[PDB]
Amino acid sequence: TEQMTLRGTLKGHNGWVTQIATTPQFPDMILSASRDKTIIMWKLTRDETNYGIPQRALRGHSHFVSDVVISSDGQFALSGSWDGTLRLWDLTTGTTTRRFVGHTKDVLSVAFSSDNRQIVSGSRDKTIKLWNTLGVCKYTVQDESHSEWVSCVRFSPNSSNPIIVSCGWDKLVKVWNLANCKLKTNHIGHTGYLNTVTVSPDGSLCASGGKDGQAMLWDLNEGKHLYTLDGGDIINALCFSPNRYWLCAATGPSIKIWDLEGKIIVDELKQEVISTSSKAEPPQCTSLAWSADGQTLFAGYTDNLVRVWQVTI
């Protein structure tokens, strides 16, 4: 099995890089949300004095941008932010098309469909909302929509069927069928507040994990529990590979990357370092996203650098 070597490092953020997102059309784009109240669009010159140079800054919020997502073409950006709004920008220029107002409290998560017309958001006002690109709120899915905050909302590939999978701090995962907003299946069996959930790239499986550090593998086509894969430390972000069944989990002391077919541990990439204090000593990796083509793996770190690896045998 293969391994990851450090292709380069991306620079040039203030505050933690909370999210990263790629677009299919440009694997040379990387959109990144950071704690600086701005989302920065980078053009990757794939380089070794850097790894890119910032293309645009999409300016301004009153509080940190927690999550971001791009179009399938990567011409528009949808950001969710803790100033209680979501903003639709034109990624390649500026100018907000719309400001989506309908939350009175923090918007943790934003996600976008592959048809680019369903936009779903999760919030700490304990709602899952379905929105149009015109700022028109189609649905406000409450009731059986977590007892607690909505940490993340993800879109399953919609050309199978339009399904969203949400994770909440009530230690449950709820799978919804959109266009009727009713539960396909409630996944019960988790421990601890769920930080993240991720869909497989054909929507067949689902990997969910949180505080417990246990990534649990579910069949998202029947709503049944496959098995559990052991971590042992809080998982901040999960992401399946687009061209493989490799799950990468950003844990507290290390990014643990595993192969889910066959089952083995591909690598454990350290990020711990001599700087003993020792209660303020670790960074943890808060995000990771696989590239379009799955050659590259970008991870967003709380040390303000996105570290890129390219797979070598």
Partner: protein
């Protein structure tokens, strides 16, 4: 110098840490929101001081239990860990040198052992 924490903050912090250990993070911003959910605090400055101290506590706590505070789950873990067995009790230690009067204590209990004799350089231990 100024604006050292008051009792009101610290009490609340102890409370929160014990009963919401798994929910709590280590990041100010998220903890600040958690304090809104799990309590009614009538000022933001007060809530910020509470939240703030609770992160500082969580950081210390996740190295095992620390001074003046303990969480129930960690107490159970230490209890189980300490099953420690340092003898089994006598080693056995039979038939070794003993003090000449400790010897007569064994002797008149139907045992006896080998025993030390003679006095050289008193005072003893000096």
């Amino acid at each position: 110098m100024g604006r050292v924490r008051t009792k009101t903050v610290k009490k609340a912090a102890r409370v929160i840490i014990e009963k919401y250990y798994t929910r709590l993070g280590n990041d100010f911003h998220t903890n600040k929101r958690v304090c809104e959910e799990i309590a009614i605090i009538p000022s933001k400055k007060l809530r910020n001081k509470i939240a703030g101290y609770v992160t500082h506590l969580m950081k210390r706590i996740q190295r095992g239990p620390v001074r003046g505070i303990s969480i129930k789950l960690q107490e159970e873990e230490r209890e189980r860990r300490d099953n420690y067995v340092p003898e089994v009790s006598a080693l056995d230690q039979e038939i070794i040198e003993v003090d000449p009067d400790t010897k007569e204590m064994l002797k008149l209990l139907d045992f006896g052992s080998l025993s030390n004799l003679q006095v050289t350089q008193p005072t003893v231990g000096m």
